[model samples]
Target chain A: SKFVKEGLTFDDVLLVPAKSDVLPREVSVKTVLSESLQLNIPLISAGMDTVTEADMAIAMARQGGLGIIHKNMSIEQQAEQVDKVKRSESGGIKDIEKVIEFPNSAKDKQGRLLVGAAVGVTADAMTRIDALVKASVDAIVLDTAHGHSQGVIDKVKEVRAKYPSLNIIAGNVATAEATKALIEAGANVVKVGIGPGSICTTRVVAGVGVPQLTAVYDCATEARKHGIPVIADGGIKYSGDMVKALAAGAHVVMLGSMFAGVAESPGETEIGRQFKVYRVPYKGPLADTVHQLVGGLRAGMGYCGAQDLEFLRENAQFIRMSGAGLLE
Target chain B: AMWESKFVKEGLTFDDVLLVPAKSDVLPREVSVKTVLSESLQLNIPLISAGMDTVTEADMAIAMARQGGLGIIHKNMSIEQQAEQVDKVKRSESGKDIEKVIEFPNSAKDKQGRLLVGAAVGVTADAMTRIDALVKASVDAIVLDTAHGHSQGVIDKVKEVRAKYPSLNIIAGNVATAEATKALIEAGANVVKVGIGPGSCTTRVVAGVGVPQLTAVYDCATEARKHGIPVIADGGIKYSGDMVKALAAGAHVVMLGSMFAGVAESPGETEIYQGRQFKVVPYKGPLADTVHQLVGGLRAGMGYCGAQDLEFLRENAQFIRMSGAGLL
Candidate 1:
């Protein structure tokens, strides 16, 4: 009525309960990625300077998810990370390299870690893609803080034109129309999130973003019509948040903060708080957190009367919440 | 309408009041910001960089003291690493490369003309071990830092350190109430730090236990002076005016964790935000420039308050409680 539509984030709504017969153990949390890339779980690590590197990427892939290598370094350095992840799991164990192996590590056709790499919208963007491609990375996540902008759309098109068959993940968009633009420009997987990370200040500085839940539902609605997956990136506070994001039509949730405390995270240690800010008390292994995340999702899915992610997306309904409900 | 000042009975922060300019013969250039930090440490300026790993490493401490201010090396590392940083500041050379130098008359230094530095320690007995190494490195002061100062741990640690080093200056706190301040002083703390949260701290937000800064400092400092101990107004300081207000509230010196984080000397990383390359801190050029403005504003603030020195300013300063519009 006032020339604006209301936006609701995860906290503003709760998933409606249904007549459920399914149990937590019966519900499946597995999902497909942007390029028909299958996963045992639906967690992806964010590609930030402090968040993901070859070390973290290997751990993410080992846990049946994907990790996108950060591009804060030179083109060669970033490409080198992808190559490291490629040959990492395939190698035999040795004392000098200290190659710690995960029990249930995911493997590709060549038995390497599943890894993606990020590229930017700049003059050197094409060269960066070429290097990543040469390194045999699984996907190229073309992104900027604002993926709806002209520069990013054009970059998506250029990357798509150059590598027609390559898996392309593009985004950071919050609107259905923006997701449609990227999809038309050849982004197979739309990353639907903006300004929802614990560390990101986009909403504070720019004041431009739809809420994560609203953004994901709207974008995922359009994205599905084209059979393109939607990756709900950032703002996943816990497994319940991830459950809400997935029920909103997101195929997977990309995480930054959740993965930061793992012994595998690239973040260094921080203060008297004794918890992770950039780095923290090494929270044992990646699998420990993954188990909790997956378990929580199953528990949430059991309440929603869903057996798998696809059915969970279709049957789940959310009711708007009052402040008191959110508080409770 | 210009108005009369009324003190609010409720909680108040620095923004709740503005110091009323009074009749003055003192010039800003003639205003002195000199302050005693503790029984053993004195500063030509009232500014003290926070003991945050991101804000005050050895380089930052050296730069701070050379600019006539003080910096406390954070206690986030191993005892040896923390002690080594103090040693670095103490032994940081002057004009060794140039083979010539002039000692600025106002530069903060020890008796041997080396840059003075302090180190923070936890409330645990491990802090005693760290203090042992720090004192061995000739640290100028020891700050027994913690979120809650009213607790038994801080009081016991203060007493233990006092008994061990009777002649040394020990700073302790993060308290808000007059009772807590008096208790810390009676336990043999040379300086009481009055703050629970500000700027980057999360004590109030998470624990919900902090008094607002203006009220906190005023009450604590009042108790502090009655016992003949100085107080550092830690936290809630955003600008030079905040420092002036803290002094007027009876703080011997003011501490800030966020302000000094961006200068070249700080340990925080540089990041790109909204297309601008900035430090996770501010884009401050060098520590000296920030010091210049701080000292500059402190002098002007004192001149406006009709005082030639901090002690006089503390006695004569008049604060007018501000309304909402006045803050803007």
Candidate 2:
């Protein structure tokens, strides 16, 4: 025990493909998001106001990924959008070294509407949360851009104390202490991703913003110990990056830009290890976008000769490269 | 030379005293650099990378481990980032000890075959988050770092970490007194780090006080030896000859900063651009080569000591004061 080493980013590390006998189509990509949220696939659409709404949420749930309704609108409308997803999902759809269970697609065991709302940590958040609770939302993320503060901590603690049975995801943290704190405060899931969002300016201006790969790795390290799950939100632009995130230690990933590019998203859109705002061109439906990501992730698992997400994480090997190796 | 005169007599550094040729038949190659870092930890090589921003991180920690040395990941990042940095190094493979350290050169590992790595933290009450994350990250040691370790908070932090994590290895420092060493060891520090002089001598300017590194190491050890704890010689070490001097002065390991500041694995931003034309260049080669040269010089110095081990060198070697043409 003596010292540290150089910093690494997603761009700096390439996962080396191992000798594989496993086929891409045969790999299982199922993952859990929290103690009660299970996904057929380890993916989610972000809570950015410009990124998700009823349609996006419906499609996401249909495809196994939960969609978090953004909080820019009225509490009633936000709750309504979540309500819409649940009603539409009487249907819906989806890491590694991770687990949580509930068939959690847009619906519960008793067939309650399945959808989450982005709730704040402000003083005004209490009534807003009650409204969401009245909407009977499946989960509510104690959401914020910067969540390591006392506000988020208090909210998480209060929410768990108020509704012990509800699935509560708290975060948007970058350090293990924050993850630990959130979990200790009764977070069912810890969301990680600081300034890795292309639409966000935090990474560009903030000194505390960390690279997503390492952020996910640290969160997963702590998250697994508690048997809770972690959501690696933001900073994933491509499907390979998603696989990289999960392999690094995440139960699932939440994407805005990738989904923002798809027709199902609410974004008027856009795309960071260094976050920036960009106008992303439209891709097709959410299904196509998700299919490609799942396929690539499956192939990523195949390349590692792993048949499951946990195996992918355990067997994954990262080859760090310099500028010269990157150029080639 | 009998010393201990900071004001009445001339002070001393590594160069102030030269090791006189001793009679013996120890081969430098055969000499074992094995030394204890603490009660439960040992390093095959007595070199440790400092937790400076420009010096150590995960990659450097892994390299240090393969060299049988240790690296202290800096606390410049969040508790999460620093914890993950330690995690990456520990997850490194082809790795350790009887059934260990056999995978490569001087490889260092824990009982689990993971590479050994440490992280530094402030002595503040808030540093508890970092200490918490680091221990959970499975870090082998916690470096209670500061400009001065004899402060109320550093000692308190040491006591707290010790109380909270009873089995953890604690390394605290920057003390130049035997009393400071005794206080920290009694507070449950597994090892003590001794750093005072800087190569640039800015320490005296910034803190308005400083100590001769060699003299500091000797003083720190006077009490550390009584408590059966190891003392780390940190700062002001410019070369391997200085390393040998520190160890002979009763330090168990040499903690480095600039020796690796220019290596490829170092985390510093090295830009050879300043003026209009050519700017100065830093050593941009592999860190492995740099470590090789360091170990070579240290081993060779042992050959001149005619001492076969670190303990033997500390016990049997003698130093004589040099004045004119001391370079000889």
Candidate 3:
């Protein structure tokens, strides 16, 4: 006889909606992003090189969600991108014939645009964290491929010790043990997922990762015990996936491919050999995309009889699905 | 904490889970696939071509029988036509030293002493006529298939068939729960087919109702095994990995439709789509090549799980649920 454990992912299960008194328009999407950071929308743009930058960040922030300025650039360049978002003001004039430009900064009461910056789990991250903190960054995300390792844990501890007052989000882990370790090391928010990304090859290259929904559930279960929020990172292909992730206990859903190739997204759109390569297409106006996504979540909440994210998490039931249901 | 009860008490499907690799001394070539298909039927390879209108005909059944697996002829045609198809399989594989075959049971052979064949039947008065024709033709087994095997009609039919022919090996299915398995088994079914709306062409799920195949197999098999019965996992098998998952989840034999549908021996015309040639059922090439590749993949999976045989694989295999993209 051998020991076996069952694990599951997002598409394998569907949220079963309860009899709802709440209407779709009445469901709230507001949720916590970190220990002291709250998001009006339960979505975050990923920090991928081709996904988020100053423009996308500004657009996301204005839509009540937050975005991380990707750390693919040098410290100075990244800081400059953050500065561009921080210096802008909200104003717009409607012109039916011309594209309206509204490059406004999404700010908190301190008059600073609330934006996060991605940092690797390395010594150099210290310097980057210091610079971003000096630039009045709202949060620091300790990014890594495997957040369960000692290196990431050490990095999270060091960041906590150095930036005691800064909102620190550490990831990407998939297990309860990893979530507990990161939370004990002072991660205000623990990112959940190992390799469930469209652009990620970690699971194929290394064969070490959990399914995204299970990862979210495992990390969230542990993180919740410590009063820490969980951010579901990667593997989000549709708005329904976001609702499922949030219902699985994630406080916020981080997206990469869903926001790719948008007009506000940083990538240069091109025609691939088989299909058009673009991020976040099919809907016009980045705000509309966000609105549609949020609207879907609201509809899902209404179906589950949940008026808010917390109720959705507590009350939502899931029915296991075969691949047939996924296609439907 | 009872994580299994609190989280996954509802269960999961094949697409929902991935088998984790365990340390192994077994090689793919060394792993055996021999297993019981029902109370009396056995297969040298744990694979069966499905009883689909576009999949298994007499030619496909002969090929499967020669390859150490089995096939059930579809009854979408008249009872005479289906019995003729089964007769062709028996005649095609005649004088092949059938006694040397180690897996199949003695009763599997026809009354005329030809090779054994299985035929699919529905739960109607017309189906009873089809069953009588099949029995008169000395067909080895009766596969009571329905869109929903949990219905009273299916159970009543199973009971009626068992009572009419006490010695006949009856395999009843297209069910998804432990309760359904128990009902069929109590009705004297020797094996239960576990799956609903998992077939490539089936739209029961799209019309809205069906369990995920993996969870269905697990739930049904858990109860079927209690009565010394075997389980046949039918449909939703897109890859060899899925076959492995089916066995690990407690299926004795894995049935395939789409995997064998596009083969040269399959009953369909090759058509071009978007400048690429594909069959109506998808995939390509001869059935032997596909079966070879699939069996190899199943052996590789068994090796990875350290299972030398199908039973060992079932006893030791662990399933981890995955995101939509995790399978790729």
- Chain B TM-scores per candidate, in order, are 0.89, 0.89, 0.84
What Cα-based lDDT does every candidate model obtain?
0.75, 0.72, 0.73
What's candidate 1's i-RMS value? 18.9
Q: Write the residue-wise lDDT of candidate 3 on A186-230 in tens digits.
A: 778888889874458887888776788788988888888778889
**Could you give candidate 2's per-residue lDDT for residues A136-188 as a string of tens digits?**
77778877678477788898888989999888888888788989998999878
Candidate 3 lDDT tens digits, B1-328: 3233435546455666789988899888888777765544666787778888888888778777767777888988888998788778777544446653554332233334455678788777788888878887666778987643555666788888888778678888767668667877888889788776553335322222345677778888889889888988877675767778888989888888767777867776677776546776455766768878888788888888888888777777777766666645
Docking class of 3: incorrect
Ranking of models by DockQ: 3, 2, 1
Clashing pairs in 3: A7-B320, A7-B321, A8-B321, A9-B322, A260-A279, A261-A279, A322-B212
Please list the residue runs of candidate 3 whose C-alpha ends up more than 4 Å from where it truly belongs after superposition: A1-3, A89-107, A197-199, A269-284, A322-328, B1-6, B9-328
TM-score of 2: 0.47
Worst 10 residues of 3 chain A by lDDT: A94-103
Which pairs clash in the backbone of model 1?
A: none
What lDDT score is found at residue B101 in candidate 1? Answer: 28
Fraction of true inter-chain Cα contacts (below 8 Å) kept per model?
Answer: 0.00, 0.00, 0.08
Is candidate 1 or 3 superior in lDDT?
Answer: 1
- Which candidate leads in DockQ? 3
Q: What are the per-residue Cα lDDT tens digits for candidate 2 across B5-123?
A: 11122235676676877876987888988887754477888888888887889978888988888999998788899888988988775232244345465788787777888889877
Q: Residue B95's C-alpha lDDT in candidate 1?
A: 31
Candidate 1 or 3, higher DockQ?
Answer: 3
